[PDB]
């Protein structure tokens, strides 16, 4: 009953597909979506996105930011800014950049610039946690 | 038949052009139509010959680029080609020279540029040593030092 | 026929000349003020 | 109201940094082509 | 005169060769743009599915209006920049007639040059370097930033672009841009859930870069 | 004949696509390759006055040209290369030149030896 | 030699053109080639003189633009260039006129336009008072009122 | 000679870029009615009023108008200055400033 739509500025992973469940990393905490789910609209944070096809198989991606919108007609639109499959990432660069950002955080002193450090910190932490 | 027959009797033809005189460049010598039988590297030296051939080549390339400039305009040229057109216009102006006998036509003073100064100035324009100076700094000057002084004055004025 | 369009005169050669002069008077202005 | 909002950022910015860090953690087999398809060339006037 | 005819023949043969080469280049660039349009049409319209389903109608009572016109920096497009400029001038007049204070944005130098003379007081920001390279979401994310970091809280907005229909046919379309107060105060946005004025701020901002990117690809 | 059939075909294709210079960076890789090979062969044909070349050296130079061994080199050096390379083949490779001159053709031994000489000088070229 | 020698014997010359005739404009008078020696403000009045000179100037401007119009098309002109082209084509068509002796092979009744009507109509096309009418509404009419009537009937 | 060197240079630079407005003003200054030949001092004065900047605000379609009006003005009141310029052959700084005031007061009045 649910018509999913998972896309990126350059790739369309799904389009009107009939899936059973979708897990998303909303800024207000994760939640999984099924058919007839209450209409909602949210914006994402770095994290996994798992899609359960009706055949019981699970695809896993990794979105960096974007927006989700579950609608009254059970139509979902998940638009990620940078969507990569999990196998296109490596753990070393994740842990490495996490340290550099952690290093720059203790070193920084300005509020705005520090937030941008933290934003990149949580960016990496969700990378290493989602990877393995 | 008269000029075409005369051509084979001369050693160094200088061909004046109306298309050049209408640009305001004097003398109106056509650089891509003048010829000399001593324009030979074994006679004028390899530096003189190389500078002359580079000047003629950049002027021919300017000719070839002016069609693209008419169609596309100037803003859609490659950067190497904008550089070519800039250096070509500068060389066009620098080939001009104020004459002692034309002091009434121009009001300028006569300049007698030595040979080494000519070779050096054109080599320096071809090398890019004066990309920062305007093109009106080379119009009706003698040696390249006069182009530099004229650019400094043109800036100090505005 | 390398400079055929501006050697023929006419609209396409008079517009080319105007465009060249516009661009390079702009550049000569932004080159003199930086001296 | 997240912390960077109190800092004065915007979700356009939060999304740029996040999408950036996710591009760096890419393996080099994919890091080049993914930085090309997502680079910025516009310039304010 | 034989010489006049020879000069003119040469000039026009050169014009023909140059236009042929430019056509070949434009036909190369047209491909890889009709291919990059399919995902950008699914992703772009997918952003505006909410405002169609929820049926946001916009405020017909507000006064500050923003008008984004999308074109490129290159010329010889034909009637591309003329259409965009015709639609911005027509809408500027219709809105100012109602007293709505309009500000203009031009994504491309052509639209700025055509409008800067007659509309200079009505102008907020313009952009450059569009068209030489295919537009990317890095471009939209920029344009969106300098629209939010501008201190101009538009009570509504509009974007004007050339909706691509076929190799021969394109149409100047126009899409709305809703402020936070329009989406928050809508009656039909009550059915949406876990919504506060913060998740509608992040969502509106991201849909400002989603409709700028969609336009740039069309 | 061997080298000149190839050179003629390549220069013909170059003449066909040569108007697309001034835009070459915005077409296929095949068109850019046509333009590159064409300008390389064009600079390969320039020659000084009162300096005629023997047929063996002409064949060696056109071989270095139409076999691809000048695509990585940029145009402004081709002529210079053409000089230095020539001297090389004249100094240390009289056997190959003499064998080509005596046979009139490039046999497989001649072909391979030319191949190695060209690639060695190109790798060791400034 | 014969027409070039006859030119110096005439007080007024009307030069017909095949290019103008093939456009359907009759009489095929070339407006940029026909002259007269009473086209002097002291003879025809400053109003007549200025209207004629403005018509010839705008036709000459259109003739100058012809090349860019022919190759690059109409879209690459400025708005002032487009306006002068529109007005010049309207003036071109308005210079045509149905003749009383030409009815038998066109059926259209011949019009005889007074001088004041001609000056007034061309003055109004030049001032911009008919920039909304289609250019085919000026073709083969008499005075400007018939042009307005034809433009109405077309709509 | 003085005023025409400047006029020639400005008209050349205008024929290059076709400042645009100044070259326009000058080209409309060149136009002349038939059988109306001007004296050399009036010619000089008009080329001056066109080349020193005193026309760069007027409408092109009014330039001609201005011109003849201006001429009348001078030839009605400033016969002394015109006789001076004619008999001297050149324009002294005295005559320069005098006709400066003349053209300025007129362009204000016009």
Swiss-Prot record, chain A:
Which positions bear N6-acetyllysine? 100, 129
Output one GO MF annotation. Answer: proton-transporting ATP synthase activity, rotational mechanism
Q: What is its main location?
A: mitochondrion
The reported result of mutating residue 46 to L is: In MC5DN5; no effect on protein abundance; decreased mitochondrial proton-transporting ATP synthase complex assembly; decreased aerobic respiration in patient cells homozygous for the mutation; partial loss of function confirmed by complementation assays
GO CC terms of this entry: mitochondrial inner membrane; mitochondrial matrix; mitochondrion; proton-transporting ATP synthase complex
Q: One biological-process term from Gene Ontology?
A: aerobic respiration
Keywords of this protein's UniProt record, alphabetized? Acetylation, ATP synthesis, CF(1), Disease variant, Hydrogen ion transport, Ion transport, Membrane, Mitochondrion, Mitochondrion inner membrane, Primary mitochondrial disease, Transit peptide, Transport
Annotated localization: Mitochondrion; Mitochondrion inner membrane
Q: Which residues are reported to carry the modification N6-succinyllysine?
A: 100, 129
- Known role: Subunit delta, of the mitochondrial membrane ATP synthase complex (F(1)F(0) ATP synthase or Complex V) that produces ATP from ADP in the presence of a proton gradient across the membrane which is generated by electron transport complexes of the respiratory chain. ATP synthase complex consist of a soluble F(1) head domain - the catalytic core - and a membrane F(1) domain - the membrane proton channel. These two domains are linked by a central stalk rotating inside the F(1) region and a stationary peripheral stalk.
Q: What is the name of the gene encoding this protein?
A: ATP5F1D
From Swiss-Prot, chain C:
Modified sites of kind Phosphoserine: 4, 28
- Ranges for the region named Disordered are 1-16
Q: Where is this region: N-terminal inhibitory region?
A: 1-17
* Post-translational note: Exhibits variability in chain length, mitochondria have distinct pools of protein cleaved after the 24th, 25th, and 26th amino acid.
List locations, semicolon-separated: Mitochondrion
Superkingdom as given in the UniProt entry: Eukaryota
Q: What is known of its domains?
A: Forms an alpha-helical dimer with monomers associated via an antiparallel alpha-helical coiled coil composed of residues 74-106, leaving each N-terminal inhibitory region (residues 26-52) accessible for interaction with an F1 catalytic domain. The inhibitory N-terminal region (residues 26-52) binds the alpha(ADP-bound)-beta(ADP-bound) (ATP5F1A-ATP5F1B) interface of F1-ATPase, and also contact the central gamma subunit (ATP5F1C).
> Family, per the entry?
Belongs to the ATPase inhibitor family.
State the oligomer form and interacting partners: Homodimer; represents the active form and is present at a pH value below 6.5. Homotetramer; represents the inactive form and is present at a pH value above 7.0.
| Listed name of the protein | ATPase inhibitor, mitochondrial
Q: What is the lineage of its organism?
A: Eukaryota, Metazoa, Chordata, Craniata, Vertebrata
Which span of the parent protein is shown here?
Answer: 36 to 70 of 106
Curated annotation (Swiss-Prot), chain E:
Topology in the membrane? Peripheral membrane protein
Q: Name one GO cellular component term.
A: mitochondrial inner membrane
- Which positions does the record annotate as the modified residue Phosphoserine? 120
Q: Which UniProt keywords apply?
A: Acetylation, ATP synthesis, CF(1), Hydrogen ion transport, Ion transport, Membrane, Mitochondrion, Mitochondrion inner membrane, Phosphoprotein, Transit peptide, Transport
The principal localisation class reads mitochondrion
Indicate where this protein resides in the cell: Mitochondrion inner membrane
* Positions where N6-acetyllysine occurs in the chain: 13, 29, 89, 128, 171
Look up the domain of life of the source: Eukaryota
Q: Which GO terms describe its molecular function?
A: proton-transporting ATP synthase activity, rotational mechanism; RNA binding
Q: Does the keyword GTP-binding apply?
A: no
Task: Point out residues bearing the modification N6-succinyllysine.
Answer: 23, 89, 128
Q: In which tissues is it expressed?
A: Isoform Heart is expressed specifically in the heart and skeletal muscle, which require rapid energy supply. Isoform Liver is expressed in the brain, liver and kidney. Isoform Heart and Isoform Liver are expressed in the skin, intestine, stomach and aorta.
Which BP terms from GO are recorded?
ATP biosynthetic process; oxidative phosphorylation; proton motive force-driven ATP synthesis; proton motive force-driven mitochondrial ATP synthesis
Family of the protein in this entry: Belongs to the ATPase gamma chain family.
Subunit structure, as described in the record = Component of the ATP synthase complex composed at least of ATP5F1A/subunit alpha, ATP5F1B/subunit beta, ATP5MC1/subunit c (homooctomer), MT-ATP6/subunit a, MT-ATP8/subunit 8, ATP5ME/subunit e, ATP5MF/subunit f, ATP5MG/subunit g, ATP5MK/subunit k, ATP5MJ/subunit j, ATP5F1C/subunit gamma, ATP5F1D/subunit delta, ATP5F1E/subunit epsilon, ATP5PF/subunit F6, ATP5PB/subunit b, ATP5PD/subunit d, ATP5PO/subunit OSCP.
Swiss-Prot record, chain G:
What function does this protein fulfil? Catalytic subunit beta, of the mitochondrial membrane ATP synthase complex (F(1)F(0) ATP synthase or Complex V) that produces ATP from ADP in the presence of a proton gradient across the membrane which is generated by electron transport complexes of the respiratory chain. ATP synthase complex consist of a soluble F(1) head domain - the catalytic core - and a membrane F(1) domain - the membrane proton channel. These two domains are linked by a central stalk rotating inside the F(1) region and a stationary peripheral stalk.
Please identify the protein, giving its name as recorded: ATP synthase F(1) complex subunit beta, mitochondrial
Sites of N6-succinyllysine modification = 153
Phosphoserine carried by residues = 46, 64
| Chain positions with N6-acetyllysine modification | 57, 111, 116, 153
- Per the similarity annotation, which family is this? Belongs to the ATPase alpha/beta chains family.
- Tell me the classification of the organism that encodes this protein: Eukaryota, Metazoa, Chordata, Craniata, Vertebrata
Q: Which organism is it from?
A: Homo sapiens
Disease implicated? Hypermetabolism due to uncoupled mitochondrial oxidative phosphorylation 2: A disorder apparent in infancy and characterized by euthyroid hypermetabolism, failure to thrive despite excessive caloric intake, intermittent hyperthermia, and developmental delay.
